[PDB]
């Protein structure tokens, strides 16, 4: 909107002037997606940052993602506008629980979802995303794996791979994606020709009623091969804007309104403040960077 056109102009000039690149997660408000150089998922953004000349990064998302970017770009300054933006699911897994479960099942590799603390990543055998988790677990020798922090994704991986997936912590889940299956019944009657796409973080009954299950990266490729005029989307509300932007010819309908409060902590105002003050810098110990990079590079190595 034109009322913010002077705010946007100061963001563009400062970003240009100080050599920032702005990376925004798909769950950011539309206003921040519209000012970002690249919008996508966590790993997509971090990988993207490795490729660029900009020595400074403004990251718009939540803490474990900004740290991922820093882990993989450690000589680059990474700032976030709100340091309290975090992932409640990720924060429920701890080093202690991982260590507890490694002892119980010492032959099982620890596969950690990218939505995990940096400290947790130092202890994982490999990282995955919702896009590549099935393939990653498939390529591991073992037929029993330890997986966290999301139980639903773990269970999905178990279904797709046929392997035993021991999920940690107990009842690990994303509250944003706990859609109700009756919501799918309801949209099918309302839009009989619509396709339902939901995230694998969604519970089993929702995944099973959906036409497609995939990551937000996967969602945004579906209309390249599906010609449907209407898609119903089971993930965080920010993806609707992303999808509408990429495919203006289609209609994107939320399965339900689902908002990640932590993702919405970032605003045009605090983003502007961040660029004015070049704060808040993501600072990690060298040793955590060194150790946590290992399972992240292995993920890339395995998928290569
Ligand atoms: O990308 C996704 O689908 C996604 C959904 C929820 C949280 C985190 C991510 C992420 O990997 O960035
Ligand atoms: S949508 Fe769920 S998994 Fe993603 S940052 Fe928010 S609470 Fe975490």
Deposited experimental method? X-ray
- Cβ neighbours of residue 233 closer than 8 Å, sequence gap 6 or more: 197, 198, 219, 239, 240, 243, 252, 253, 254, 255
Mutate to test the pocket of ligand 2, among 260, 264, 265 (most ligand atoms within 8 A of CB): 260
CB atoms within 10 A of CB 21: 21
Contact of 128 with 68, CB cutoff 8 Å:
no
Ligand 2 atom at minimum distance from 261 CA: 6
Domain boundaries, the chain: 1-81+265-285, 88-173, 174-257
Using CB distances shorter than 6 Å, the residues near ligand 2 are 62, 87-89, 115, 174, 176, 236, 260, 262-263
Residues composing the chain: 304
Instruction: State in Å: Cα 258 to ligand 2 middle.
Output: 11
How many whole angstroms separate alpha carbon 88 and alpha carbon 169? Answer: 12
Pairing state between β 77-79 and 144-148: unpaired
Instruction: Please give the annotated binding residues, written as ranges.
Output: 25, 42, 87, 113-115, 130, 174, 199-201, 216, 260
Residue 166 token pair: 């021991």
Tokens coding 156: 């999905």
Quick one: how far is CA 138 from the chain centroid? Answer: 21
Closest to 47 in 3D by CA, of 78, 69, 75, 19 = 69
Report the sign of the C-alpha dihedral through residues 93, 94, 95, 100, in that order. Answer: negative
The structure tokens listed for 169 are: 């912590």
Q: How far apart are the first and last CA of the chain?
A: 41
HEC letters along the chain: CHHHHHHHHHHHHHHHHCCEEEEEECCCCHHHHHHCCEEECHHHHHHHHHCCCCCEEEEECCHHHHHHHHHHCCCCEEECCCCCCCCHHHHCCCHHHHHHHHHHCCCCCEEEECCCCHHHHCCCCEEECCCCHHHHHHHCCCCEEEEECCHHHHHHHHHHHCCEEEECCCCCCCHHHCCCCHHHHHHHHHCCCCEEEECCCCCHHHHHHCCEECCHHHHCCHHHCCCCCEEEEECCCHHHHHHHHHCCCCEEEECCCCCCCCHHHCCHHHHHHHHHHCCCECCCCHHHHHHHHHHHHHHHHHHC
Inter-residue contact 59 to 15 (CB < 8 Å): no
What residues form DSSP beta bridges with 197? 212, 233
Give the CA diameter of the chain.
59
Residue pair 111/140 in contact by the 8 Å Cβ criterion: yes
Distance CA 196, CA 304 (A): 30
What is the CA(33)–ligand 2 centre distance, in A? 17
Q: Atom 3 (ligand 2): residue with closest C-alpha?
A: 174
Cβ–Cβ under 8 Å, residues 206 and 194: no
Burial class of 162 by CB neighbour count within 10 A (0 to 12, 13 to 18, 19+): exposed
The CATH topology of domain 88-173 is: Rossmann fold (3.40.50)
Contact indicator for 31, 269 with CB cutoff of 8 Å: no
* Token digits of residue 165: 């997936």
Peptide bond into 280 cis (omega under 30): yes
Q: Check if 114 has its Cβ closer than 6 Å to any atom of ligand 1.
A: yes
What CATH number does domain 1-81+265-285 carry, 3.20.20.70, 3.90.1150.10, 3.30.499.10, 3.40.50.10800? 3.40.50.10800
Domain covering 174-257 in this structure, CATH number:
3.40.50.10800
Instruction: Collect contacts of 277-281 with beta carbons under 8 A, ≥24 apart.
Output: 278/18, 278/56, 278/77, 278/79, 279/79, 280/79, 280/80, 280/81, 280/83, 281/77, 281/78, 281/79
């Amino acid at each position: 909107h034109h009322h913010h056109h002077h705010m946007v102009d100061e963001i563009l000039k400062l970003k240009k002037e100080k050599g920032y690149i702005i990376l925004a997660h798909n769950f950011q408000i539309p206003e921040l997606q519209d000012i970002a150089d690249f919008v996508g998922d966590s790993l997509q953004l971090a990988r993207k940052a490795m490729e660029l000349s900009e020595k400074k990064i403004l990251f718009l998302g939540v803490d474990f993602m900004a740290e991922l970017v820093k882990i993989l770009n450690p000589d680059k300054k990474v700032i976030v506008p709100d340091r309290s933006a975090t992932c409640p699911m990720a924060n429920r897994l701890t080093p202690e629980i991982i260590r507890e479960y490694r002892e119980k099942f010492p032959d099982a590799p620890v596969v950690l979802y990218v939505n995990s603390t940096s400290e947790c990543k130092t202890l994982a055998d490999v990282i995955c995303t919702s896009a590549n988790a099935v393939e990653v677990v498939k390529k591991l020798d073992s037929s029993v794996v330890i997986f966290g922090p999301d139980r639903n994704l773990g269970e999905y991986v178990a279904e797709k791979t046929g392997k035993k997936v021991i999920t940690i912590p107990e009842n690990g889940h994303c509250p944003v994606h706990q859609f109700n299956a009756e919501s799918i019944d309801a949209v099918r009657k309302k839009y009989p020709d619509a396709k339902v796409i939901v995230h694998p973080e969604c519970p089993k009954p929702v995944r099973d009623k959906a036409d497609y299950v995939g990551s937000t990266g996967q969602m945004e490729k579906i209309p390249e091969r599906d010609p449907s005029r209407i898609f119903v989307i089971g993930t965080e509300i920010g993806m609707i804007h992303k999808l509408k932007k990429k495919f203006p010819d289609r209609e994107f309908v939320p399965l339900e309104m689902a908002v990640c409060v932590n993702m919405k902590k970032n605003t045009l105002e605090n983003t502007l403040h961040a660029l004015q003050t070049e704060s808040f810098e993501v600072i990690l110990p060298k040793e955590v960077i060194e150790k946590a990079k290992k399972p992240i590079l292995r993920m890339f190595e395995l998928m290569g």
